[PDB]
Design a protein around this nucleic acid. Sequence first.
RNA 1: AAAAACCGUAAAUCCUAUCUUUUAAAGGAAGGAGAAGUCGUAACAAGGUUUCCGUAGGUGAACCUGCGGAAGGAUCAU
RNA 2: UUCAAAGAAUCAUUCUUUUUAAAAUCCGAUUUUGUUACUUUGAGUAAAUUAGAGUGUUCAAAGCAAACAGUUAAAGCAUUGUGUUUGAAUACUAUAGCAUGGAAUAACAAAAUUGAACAAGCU
RNA 3: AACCUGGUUGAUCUUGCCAGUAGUCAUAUGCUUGUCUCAAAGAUUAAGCCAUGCAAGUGAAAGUAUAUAUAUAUAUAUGUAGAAACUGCGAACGGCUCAUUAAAACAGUUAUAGUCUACUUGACAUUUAUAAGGAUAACUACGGAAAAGCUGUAGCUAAUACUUGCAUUAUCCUUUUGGAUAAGUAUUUGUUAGAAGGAAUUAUAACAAAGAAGUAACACGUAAAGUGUGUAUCAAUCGAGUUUCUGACCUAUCAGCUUUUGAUGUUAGGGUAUUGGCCUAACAUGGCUAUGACGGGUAACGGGGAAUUAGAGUUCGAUUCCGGAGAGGGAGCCUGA
RNA 4: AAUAGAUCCGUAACUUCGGGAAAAGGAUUGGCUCUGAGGACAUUAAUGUUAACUCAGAACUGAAACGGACAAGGGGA
Lengths: 257, 146, 171
Amino acid sequence: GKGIKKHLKRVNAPSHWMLNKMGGQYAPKTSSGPHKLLESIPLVILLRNRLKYALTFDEVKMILIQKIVKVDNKVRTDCTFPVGLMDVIHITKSNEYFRLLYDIKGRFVPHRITNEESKYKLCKVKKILLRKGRLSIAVTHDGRSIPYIHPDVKVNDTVRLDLETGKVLEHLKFQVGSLVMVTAGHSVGRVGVISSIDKNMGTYDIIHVKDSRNKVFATRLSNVFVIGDNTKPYISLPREKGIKLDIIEERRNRLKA
Amino acid sequence: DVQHERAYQKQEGASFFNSKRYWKKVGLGFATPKEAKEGVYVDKKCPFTGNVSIRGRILKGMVISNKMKRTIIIRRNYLHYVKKYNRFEKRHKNIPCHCSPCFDVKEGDIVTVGQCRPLSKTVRFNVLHVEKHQIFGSARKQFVLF
Amino acid sequence: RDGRHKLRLTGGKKKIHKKKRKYELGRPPSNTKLGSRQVHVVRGRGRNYKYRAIKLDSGSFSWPTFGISKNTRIIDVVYNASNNELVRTKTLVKNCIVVIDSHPFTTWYENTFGTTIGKSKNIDPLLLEQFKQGRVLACISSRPGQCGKADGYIIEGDELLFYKRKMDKRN
RNA sequence: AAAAACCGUAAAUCCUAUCUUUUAAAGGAAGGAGAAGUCGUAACAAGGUUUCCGUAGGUGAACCUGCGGAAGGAUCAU
RNA sequence: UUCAAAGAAUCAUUCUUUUUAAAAUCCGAUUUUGUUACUUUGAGUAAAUUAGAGUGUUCAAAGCAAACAGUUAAAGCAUUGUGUUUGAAUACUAUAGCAUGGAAUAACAAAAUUGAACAAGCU
RNA sequence: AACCUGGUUGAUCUUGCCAGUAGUCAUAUGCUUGUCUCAAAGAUUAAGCCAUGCAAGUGAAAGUAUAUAUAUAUAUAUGUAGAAACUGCGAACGGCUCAUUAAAACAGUUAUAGUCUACUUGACAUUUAUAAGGAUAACUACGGAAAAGCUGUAGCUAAUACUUGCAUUAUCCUUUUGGAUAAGUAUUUGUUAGAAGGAAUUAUAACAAAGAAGUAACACGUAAAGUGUGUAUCAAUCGAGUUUCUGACCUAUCAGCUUUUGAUGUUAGGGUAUUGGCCUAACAUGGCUAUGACGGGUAACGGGGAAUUAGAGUUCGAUUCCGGAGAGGGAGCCUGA
RNA sequence: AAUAGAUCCGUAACUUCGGGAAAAGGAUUGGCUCUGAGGACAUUAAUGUUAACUCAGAACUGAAACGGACAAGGGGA
């Protein structure tokens, strides 16, 4: 037979998963869920190699059976559950909140988040579908179909999502002052306020976005995420602040200590 | 006088008697000809009249044979760079594309072509524009960089 | 069964590899005829149940000019744009011509407007004569082999004239 | 449910036609190599008949002859 | 088939900037003016492997780690205790395709057995 | 490290090849071998044949539990477990080999506005009820042969296996509030209108006809109301099938090939999860080709990759991973996403 | 004895290039319901009088069998 494949070779794992060479041959293939396999990461390596909490798949499974892990204030027991691009994960008894963001290196990293900020989550809608009854739903990158969005919300606009009540709060457009962040570009991890949009006739829309340090770089419209307006990032950015310090001067900063 | 086969052509998706011939502009920065606007032709595979949706690759090509009914052969000449010799090489291949009856075509004219769903087993392209170009000799031999 | 072991467009042979898979399938055709309303069900890939009509007698038929549709019964098949033994053996297809009943449409006419929405449309004298004869033609549009029912529309106007002249400078 | 007929997919076997690979093959005609063998002087000097080409014929062999060419000739020259 | 001229900065030079016909656009000034090849930049550019960063497996083949004070406590921080810093980047992933700056070099068309633009009037 | 040396001669300079030289993650083999780390290994030929043993099963809150065993106060209610068996999922993953394969597979780049999509996730639905009907294993009892991962009748029970079936909502008028109007989800047919995309016959709305599969007659117990299992639909998920544009080794002592046996295309129709000569009927004579078609060979799976390199290039790539193929050779089929 | 007429298809070695050749080797023809197509005569693009035997595919049929008698090569190395 030639059905759906249910194995992932360790060398075939996505680069940002970061599985070693000698630590086996099979990588934990994320179960079907809300996000892609290539750009999302599973609880196994999130809790084993990123948090360094455990040491063995048996012990990783020993943790999740106790309902001491929560994502979007929702309990998940699926061991190979794709977390998503950015979410709200929560472990109860230690009273801590991790949010998943990007690195200047272009990776997935847990990020310390307070309770009030963890109550705040964002979703980028992928398309709007209107069903019977002239009602509208938007499907987000989170694999969520949120119905009855504001009429002003468009296909590229993003929506503040209140995870507990499961409702939209505030829309964010794609203006020249719309501060965004790169998701799947070769310039992953760079936070920017966009400079201009370069619409092209029927092909992927490449847009130029402007960095804080006055660097302009372009990426497709498909891998942008509006994470706030020009005022400030709505989400607490990681230590690197989303500013791609150049590879040349990274070395002098590491040399000085 | 508009149909002559052993069947009837209905021009599906056109509406007949309510209102307030069908046409479509297929986008891609193109406008339908007045020929297709006010003609009498009926075709289920015309981009401007039929059910075919234009999507995929858009090409420019060199018409080869017109005496074939409702279809034409499109040559596309190009130079193939050879890495070993650092030199180009004249190569080609001809693709068959469906030509709508709403166009006048002659052997020797450039034609703009767009991709559609598989129309025959080897014909999955449709004409959109006829650029008049009048040629001498055999249309096979002349080389155009397009 | 689909999409291989044919000749290349240049005329050359394409010798076969890739021994036949299942997703090509190609189930045998089903010939629907006149008879009781019995059908079978076939299981297509992904657990899709297809309503194979092996013998049909009645279905929905629509008056396009009035925008209506009612259930009536076909009694005979007279022509298809395909080969001739297909209609000679009483088969139904998605562009065949059948003979439809007149009385239920006449009752609809009498109840809606009378006389022997968007009403007052003048209909057609030839269609009225056919209704008086009680034997009016129609063209089946549904796919009996796929959907399992014979949904047709009442043929009218210039197309009716075309389908009539080819039947009767004629034999 | 056994069972039968029909188009349909079609294993496997046989007729003819074609393509591909070895070899049996009696025998034939070669080529190459070894080897103090026999006969002759063919070329190398004007090699004792200048050499050579193409063609044609003869001859035991290298070779001989005719026709038309070449000097890579033995002549750069009344 | 569009030449050229004028001005700031290193060493005597080199380097940068500005404009100079015609058609539509803005009330003395706001600005686009053939196709392609080619050429510049980008976006998708699987991992392993390749070169390469950082890292003393005894060095190395390695591998992707580890380091830091701590005969046992100090600071950082939390309104008593809680370790911290980190790294796993980079180029490549054709020549084909998408967008893109483009003066040169190349081709293609337009160029008078007649073809135009403007103005007035007519339908 | 962008390198040369010996060999034609009495002697010389050339052309010219032979030999020398070094590398190979490229194989075999001879001699020898005190240590440690590291580890190729029936590819080459026979994708030849296989003795033998193993390689896919599964129950920890949660389907069925009188085979049975044990503990709480007294034949009483709970349990804790549980052989067998019914049911559910998987077994279509993985592992192996490279025969076949020459615009095929593959690779990069496109579309699917021409399709399907299990588990999972998020939203959400339409035309006797203090809970309905059968159909049966294991099991008891008789055996058969030498036997199968074999089996007959008699009798019984279940379940989340199979099968029927228990409101209500929206809209219009005075205008919080009273009346009235109407009730089909996908899917299919005929007639109109029509937030986005690049282009819809789009989403969707209206009219006239059909229209399945459902909306729990199921099991466990968390806040000092919950969960599992299962159901109609939409989207992603994990993918898969078709698909555009470009790229391939040698061979002309293969020049014209394909076309009644579909060849090239139109119409019409069947068939597919969907387009399509995929198939059929009619119609037309077309289509490819020295820019090498059609043939033949490959001791040819393809790719990134390996050796070698100053740069060019040359050769290899069965083999860690990806895509394709096959399970002694063809062909057919159920099951199941 | 074996076919042997006719139509359609196909036809090797060899060759003096003319042949070999009816090479070899196939299919059909039965029976009927059919159908369709291919000349001379006349009016201001068309419609009326009148004389072929060549093809074709769908049927069904009849005892899966048919140049039905007659007449009429056996081929190949």
